[PDB]
Amino acid sequence: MNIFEMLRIDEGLRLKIFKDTEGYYTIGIGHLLTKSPSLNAAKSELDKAIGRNTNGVITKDEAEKLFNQDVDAAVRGILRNAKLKPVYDSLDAVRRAALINMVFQMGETGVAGFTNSLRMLQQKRWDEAAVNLAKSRWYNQTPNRAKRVITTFRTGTWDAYK
């Protein structure tokens, strides 16, 4: 198990524009296109992202390319962020993947705002962090996925993904 396989499990793969859990146009492996209600706007984002006039449909290779970029972007976002970087640096490899997962789903700014959870993680108070993390809109709206990510933070193992 690794961060790519983990996120593939959590996000799935769809090759045509669809709406994510929040109702936002998305494609591939959890690649957010736009928060705009306009499908035309979403298609324009897709064409710009892929570099060609798409029919709202991409190939698996193209989906995987966006995915590589998006995982890279999540790590880059963590490392450039004054709140997230020390937490990331403090973590083991498995829990680092859990933090990347959160940033992939919610963005750098969103996760950086989990101040108390981040502190408990940095303190390595794992059960307490797990309890605190679940007190969130994140957990309530996507509880099965959040449960997996939280179990990964709690245990430092891949048990929730095996």
Annotate 41-52 with b (16+ C-beta within 10 A) or e (fewer): ebbebbeebbee
Residues classed as catalytic? 11, 20
Sheet containing 31-32: order of strands: 14-19, 25-28, 31-32
Give resolution in angstroms: 1.5
Range 144-151 contact pairs with CB under 8 angstroms and sequence separation of 24 or more: 145/10, 145/105, 148/10, 149/10, 149/98, 149/101, 149/102
Specify the amino acid at residue 160: A
Please indicate if the annotation marks 36 as binding a ligand: no
Dist CA 114 CA 102 (whole Å): 11
Please indicate if the annotation marks 153 as binding a ligand: no
Q: Which among 150, 21, 97 is positioned nearest to 12, based on CA atoms? A: 21
CATH of domain 3-155: 1.10.530.40
Q: What was the elucidation method?
A: X-ray
CB neighbours of residue 141 within 10 Å: 11
Task: Enumerate the domain spans of the chain.
Answer: 3-155
